[PDB]
From a paper:
Volume-regulated anion channels (VRACs) participate in the cellular response to osmotic swelling. These membrane proteins consist of heteromeric assemblies of LRRC8 subunits, whose compositions determine permeation properties. VRACs are composed of proteins belonging to the conserved LRRC8 family, whose expression is restricted to chordates. This family contains five members in humans, termed LRRC8A–E. All of them share a close sequence relationship and consist of an N-terminal pore domain (PD) followed by a cytoplasmic leucine-rich repeat domain (LRRD). In these assemblies, LRRC8A (or SWELL1) constitutes an obligatory subunit, which is essential for the targeting of channels to the plasma membrane.
We then set out to characterize the full-length protein and collected cryo-EM data for an LRRC8C homomer from three independent preparations. Unexpectedly, the two-dimensional (2D) classes from these datasets showed in all cases a heptameric assembly, which was confirmed by 3D reconstruction. Despite the large size of the combined dataset, the non-symmetrized reconstruction of the full-length protein did not reach high resolution, probably due to the intrinsic mobility of the complex. After application of C7 symmetry, we were able to obtain a structure extending to 4.6 Å for the full-length protein and 4.1 Å for the PD. At low contour, the map displays an envelope for the entire protein, and at higher threshold, where the density of the more mobile LRRDs has largely disappeared, it defines the structure of its membrane-inserted portion. This map allowed a molecular interpretation with subunits consisting of the structure of the PD determined by cryo-EM and the X-ray structure of the LRRD to obtain a symmetric channel with a pore radius of 6 Å at its extracellular constriction. In this assembly, close subunit interactions are restricted to the extracellular part, whereas contacts within the remainder of the protein are scarce. In contrast, there are fewer contacts in the case of LRRC8C homomers, which have formed a larger heptameric assembly. In this case, the LRRDs show increased mobility compared to the A subunits, and we did not find any indication of tight subunit interactions. Similarly, the interaction interface in the PD is reduced and restricted to contacts between the ESDs. In that respect, the larger heptameric assembly of LRRC8C homomers described in this study is noteworthy, as it would allow for a further increase of the pore radius, although there is so far no evidence for the existence of heteromeric channels with larger oligomeric organization in a physiological context.
Author numbering:
A (entry chain F): 16 to 59, 95 to 176, 236 to 527, 531 to 804
B (entry chain E): 254 to 304
Write the structure that this text describes.
């Protein structure tokens, strides 16, 4: 602030200025004290030469000739030197006395001292500096737009050089002017009776000698400026390249500096070569990253990670990550986790320390741009079995995931078509068995054909995209489970008819109206599960009777009003979903569905229940729901295996006590109105709620 | 990696030795020059009437 801004030439100039100021003050003092002119009339055994002149006349003559004969420069030399020294001092100190650049200088001094003070600089070369990086970058952005301070300093140096040149040029001629003795011929005759006078003043010779030495000082002063001027105009201090810190410490950051920054760097380096080295560290971005890593390590402990450990959806020990700046190393200390979850974590690099986590088979990624290490990639290829990835604009999709051979289940949540899906070939995935895609795929990508040799389950659930091209799905010979949710086909696709190995079929939100393609489903004798969620189905074709393998039927949220009798011919159906439909009467043929265990007609218009419905003694889940039933038949007591009942939303008046005969159906599984439950006998309700 | 400080100190000592040598060399001769009394003959005649 007051000392680190002085190069050696500046110190020498300051010392010379101090010496010149002392010389000027001494000269002024002697001029005031002893600088007197003695005068005598000039023209006239040797005897005395009395001039019969009084003291007053002598003083008058001294004053007159002093004003006349004595050289103006000779008389003004002390004041002249004092003024020149004061101007030199003022132009030297105006560099820091100007507040506009003084603020920048003070900020630079503070930041340089703080950066040199931080031991983390030495640690990086071999705590709160993390926030100090923000001040460092603020200063580098703000002050690189300056360079005016360099121009100010150059102008000051030029002014000093010009002053020195003028000083030498005129003082060289003026020094010879002064003389010890002098002669003056003023018109003091008829005033004092004399005209010619010889005079002298004491300081002259001394002044001469003094002036000589003074000139020498100024000469050196000028020479000093020349060197600095040469140093100003030989090195081009506007740009500074380290080329040594990068070579030694092996850091490619800190490329270069602007005019003002290079100027200040040169000044500090000339003042001290090591201060620049210590200050350059906080410009490095990699150093900032490592300091943030150290701060995160201080912030994060394995205890916090183990606290956040929980059970994932697919039965694994998972550590969800929701907002982090990287990978804490303590996470690699906890190998018991089988799954890992990442949410909104950008700029992630996976080191070889992932090899520590042996018992890892699942990974969850939510909007994360992640890259791996070679050992990390090999470990993921050889160990991972399940993978979940969420990406928004494909920038968080890691390409190396296409090379994981041992992966079994993969989940994609992110648009791929944005028409063709932007999917790379799935050839390396030699063990992929389950695939789930959440995208906007219009035509099926060819990459899936590269995995169908061992693929068993492929799921594509678009947000409404029509599956216009079904050509590749016929290649899924090994596929046993297929779900096409919101594929907007409006009909049963012909591709599904080409998959004889299929077992479970889902067509949720496909808006199927004409479903007369059931005959084609007769080519599939393994169709155990068929799903038709959220469609406009109003008619059930008779051909559904020919599906021998049917075990589960789904027709919830459709336009079904009158359900045909032959719909009950599939005696092997165990799950029958008829809720949220226009069903009003249940045909008695449902009694033949002895194997049935599920029945849901919630949000339908059912008004009565046939007694044959109670013949299905294997029914363990009966969801009557919100219907138009006004009374409850006692035959419900026959269902000893019934575990769940849902009759809330109906017109029931009194519940028969036979509901107590349902052993597996308790109060928790009983969905009835409060009055309906209270109408039951005390013993029945006590046995339902507890064991009395 | 320094050793420049030793050279600086050597230069300072050499300068001091040279200064002392010059001081002795000229002061030894110059001391005898001064005298208490002195005589001067200047052209102060026709100015004060004496030389």
């Amino acid at each position: 602030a007051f000392r680190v801004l002085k190069p050696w030439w500046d110190v020498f100039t300051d010392y010379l200025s101090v010496a010149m100021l002392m010389i000027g003050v001494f000269g002024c003092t002697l001029q005031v004290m002893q600088d007197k002119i003695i005068c005598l009339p000039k023209r006239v055994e040797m005897k005395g030469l009395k001039t019969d002149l009084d003291l007053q006349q002598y003083s008058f003559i001294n004053q007159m000739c002093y004003e006349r004969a004595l050289h103006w420069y000779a008389k003004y030399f002390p004041y002249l030197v004092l003024i020149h020294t004061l101007v030199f001092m003022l132009c030297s100190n105006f560099w820091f006395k100007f507040p506009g650049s003084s603020s920048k200088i003070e900020h630079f001094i503070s930041i340089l001292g703080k950066c040199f003070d931080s031991p983390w600089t030495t640690r990086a070369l071999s705590e709160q500096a993390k926030a100090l990086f923000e001040k460092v970058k603020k200063f580098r952005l703000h002050v690189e737009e300056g360079d005016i301070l360099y121009a100010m300093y150059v102008r000051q140096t030029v002014l000093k050089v010009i002053k020195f040149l003028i000083i030498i040029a005129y003082n060289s001629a003026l020094v010879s002017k002064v003389q010890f003795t002098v002669d003056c011929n003023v018109d003091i005759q008829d005033m004092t009776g004399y005209k010619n006078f010889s005079c002298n003043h004491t300081m002259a010779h001394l002044f001469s000698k003094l002036s000589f030495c003074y000139l020498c000082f100024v000469s050196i002063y000028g020479l000093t400026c020349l060197y600095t001027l040469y140093w100003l105009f030989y090195r081009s201090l506007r740009e500074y390249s380290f080329e040594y810190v990068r070579q030694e410490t092996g850091i490619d950051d800190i490329p270069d500096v602007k005019n003002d920054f290079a100027f200040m760097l040169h000044m500090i380096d000339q003042y001290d070569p090591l201060y620049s080295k210590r200050f350059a560290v906080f410009l490095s971005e990699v150093s900032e990253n490592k300091l943030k890593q150290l701060n995160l390590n201080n912030e994060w402990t394995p205890d916090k990670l183990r606290q956040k450990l929980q059970t994932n959806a697919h039965n694994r020990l998972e550590l969800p990550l929701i907002m982090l700046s990287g990978l804490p190393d303590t996470v690699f200390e906890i190998t018991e986790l089988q799954s890992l979850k990442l949410e909104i974590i950008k700029n992630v690099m996976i080191p070889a320390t992932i090899a520590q986590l042996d018992n890892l088979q699942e990974l969850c990624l939510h909007q994360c741009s992640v890259k791996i290490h070679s050992a990390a990639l090999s470990f993921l290829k050889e160990n991972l079995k399940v993978l979940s990835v969420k990406f928004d604009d494909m920038r968080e999709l890691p390409p190396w995931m296409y090379g994981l051979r041992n992966l079994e289940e993969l989940y994609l949540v992110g648009s791929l078509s944005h028409k063709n899906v932007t999917l790379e070939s799935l050839r390396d995935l030699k063990s992929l068995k389950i695939l789930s895609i959440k995208s906007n795929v219009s035509k099926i990508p060819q990459a899936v054909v590269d995995v169908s040799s061992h693929l068993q389950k492929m799921c594509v659930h678009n947000d409404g995209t029509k599956l216009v091209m079904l050509n590749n799905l016929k290649k899924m010979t090994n596929l046993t489970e297929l779900e096409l949710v919101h594929c907007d086909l409006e009909r049963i696709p012909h591709a599904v008819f080409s998959l004889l190995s299929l077992q479970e079929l889902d067509l949720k939100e496909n808006n199927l109206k004409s479903i007369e393609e059931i005959v084609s489903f007769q080519h599939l004798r393994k169709l155990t599960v068929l799903k038709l969620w959220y469609n406009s189905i109003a008619y059930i074709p008779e051909h559904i009777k020919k599906l021998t393998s049917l075990e589960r039927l789904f027709f919830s949220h459709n336009k079904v009003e009158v359900l045909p009798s032959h719909l009950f011919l599939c005696n092997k159906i165990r799950y029958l979903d008829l809720s949220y439909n226009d069903i009003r009467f249940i045909p008695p043929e449902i009694g033949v569905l002895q194997s049935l265990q599920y029945f849901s007609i919630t949000c339908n218009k059912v008004e009565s229940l046939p007694d044959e419905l109670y013949f299905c003694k294997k029914l363990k889940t009966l969801k009557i729901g919100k219907n138009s039933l006004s009374v409850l038949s006692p035959k419900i007591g026959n269902l000893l295996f019934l575990s769940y009942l849902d009759i809330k939303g109906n017109h029931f008046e009194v519940l028969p006590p036979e509901l107590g005969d349902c052993r597996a159906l308790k109060r928790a599984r009983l969905v009835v109105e409060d009055a309906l439950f209270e109408t039951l006998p005390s013993d029945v309700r006590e046995q339902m709620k507890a064991d009395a």
